[PDB]
Write a protein that binds this ligand. Sequence first.
Ligand SMILES: Nc1ncnc2c1ncn2[C@@H]1O[C@H](COP(=O)(O)OP(=O)(O)O)[C@@H](O)[C@H]1O
Ligand SMILES: Nc1ncnc2c1ncn2[C@@H]1O[C@H](COP(=O)(O)OP(=O)(O)O)[C@@H](O)[C@H]1O
Lengths: 131, 261
Amino acid sequence: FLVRGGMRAVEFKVVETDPSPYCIVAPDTVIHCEGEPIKREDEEESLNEVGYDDIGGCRKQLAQIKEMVELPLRHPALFKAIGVKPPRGILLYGPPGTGKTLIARAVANETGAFFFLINGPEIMSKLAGES
Amino acid sequence: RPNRLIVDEAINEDNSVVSLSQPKMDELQLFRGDTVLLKGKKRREAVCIVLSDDTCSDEKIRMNRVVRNNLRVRLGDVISIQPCPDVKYGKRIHVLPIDDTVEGITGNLFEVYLKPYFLEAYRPIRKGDIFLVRGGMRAVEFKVVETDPSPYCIVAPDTVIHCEGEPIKREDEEESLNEVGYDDIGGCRKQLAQIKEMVELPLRHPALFKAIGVKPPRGILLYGPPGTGKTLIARAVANETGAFFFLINGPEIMSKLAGES
Ligand SMILES: Nc1ncnc2c1ncn2[C@@H]1O[C@H](COP(=O)(O)OP(=O)(O)O)[C@@H](O)[C@H]1O
Ligand SMILES: Nc1ncnc2c1ncn2[C@@H]1O[C@H](COP(=O)(O)OP(=O)(O)O)[C@@H](O)[C@H]1O
């Protein structure tokens, strides 16, 4: 569970309780916040990444992207069973700084994918014909 | 020999129809709905149902694509037609779907495809042929492997149909379907006629005109807005006349590192 505080985001984990596992925090209970910090569970699940709640002012465009991307990524087997051509490319154009990379990252993280980024200048300046 | 005829493009898209002119029926004493036996190349065989049509010429026979691939012949060749009145109602039919047509269906094919197509149709079939059934989102082909009596039979309500088993793998000389033909082009009648005018003769019969001696065409420019389907026209012509269509792309010759382009 994640709790909002002073300037950052802090997330805490419970290791045990009584009775176990279910309980409700009551005014009359004993809490201990003493102990060395634990490491990541190693299943990612990082809540500090981006989601659909970190984008605002682009509701219609996000609706269109969800409409035309959710099915080919979530359900590939059924789509290849139907046998209809899926989209192969999407263009996002607008003034710089409006948050296109944010939209791509949010879609990739939430739907479940392998977001792989290719820079323009980085590829351009790779010397010889090795680009 | 006033029995043979030259095949031609048809209009009726049913799998068991042929179109003959009325003088042909008068000469061969052909009625409507009879069963005729069709002989072609490679010693292949199939049966069909005669239908009346005045558009085709007397020397010309109109027939669809499935029977044309059944006979292993292309448009412009010759076939032998005769009345075949000895056919009688079949008893049992064994059908098996093709491997590369049912990828991801997993259902009762008998109730889905066979039942409507064979309904009140009286379609005559011969062992070894392939027929195509329209369905939900795809097209499924069945190759009849056993019938009683063999080789000819007629669909009747009290016939045994078996639609269970491991789907048969594709053949080699089968002339695989799903390749674009002349039915996949629409709204381009005049230009397709012009293209077929100057390309059919030097491709079908290659030696005759050279012996006569003429200058065959050596280049055709197809120009128009993108997306109008020029590659489709080229591929259809190549797959119909019979050739070795060898596409070379534009950018692929430019992406190579200079010297090897
Ligand atoms: N809801 C939002 N809409 C638009 N921009 C946002 C939003 N939330 C945050 N941003 C800011 O937009 C920036 C996107 O940076 P950048 O990838 O350069 O955008 P683009 O690549 O579209 O120019 C982020 O640094 C972020 O701070
Ligand atoms: N009768 C037709 N006329 C024009 N286009 C068609 C026809 N039938 C199908 N098409 C479409 O044309 C597409 C192929 O054309 P294409 O090879 O892109 O031509 P070009 O490359 O010259 O733009 C197919 O995807 C198909 O959907």
